[PDB]
Amino acid sequence: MFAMYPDWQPDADFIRLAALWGVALREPVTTEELASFIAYWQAEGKVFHHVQWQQKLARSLQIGRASNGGLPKRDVNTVSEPDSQIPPGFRG
């Protein structure tokens, strides 16, 4: 894997890589979104490979924007801590 520090700044590489990774960024990046990623990134204290980073940041902004509409909350309670299982698909 490959670790890093939360002192990185946004640049063209962010949109360039994201666009190639499979993410089309239209509107500028928000602070809540950026801070969120850094919050879990530093809180995790783990390491992720290059490919893992592309997928993490990709699926994060991909599934994040699609959900970002009315109000991202989803308060159901009674959960055993989900590990992001059961990915999306076509379902037929």
Pairwise CA distance, residues 17 & 54, whole Å: 8
What sign results for the dihedral spanned by CA atoms 4, 10, 16, 22? positive
Please indicate if the annotation marks 41 as binding a ligand. Answer: yes
Please indicate if the annotation marks 37 as binding a ligand. Answer: yes
Bridge partners, residue 48, by sequence:
2
Please indicate if the annotation marks 5 as binding a ligand. Answer: no
Q: Would you give the DSSP letter of residue 69?
A: S
Pairwise CA distance, residues 4 & 50, whole Å: 11
Please indicate if the annotation marks 73 as binding a ligand. Answer: no
Q: Which two tokens stand for residue 6?
A: 């939360």
Buried b (16+ CB within 10 A) or exposed e, 68-88: eeeeeeeeeeeeeeeeeeeee
Q: How was this structure determined?
A: NMR
Pairwise CA distance, residues 72 & 60, whole Å: 14
Please indicate if the annotation marks 90 as binding a ligand. Answer: no
Pairwise CA distance, residues 73 & 38, whole Å: 19
Please indicate if the annotation marks 59 as binding a ligand. Answer: yes
Buried b (16+ CB within 10 A) or exposed e, 1-20: eeeeeeeeeeeeebeeebee
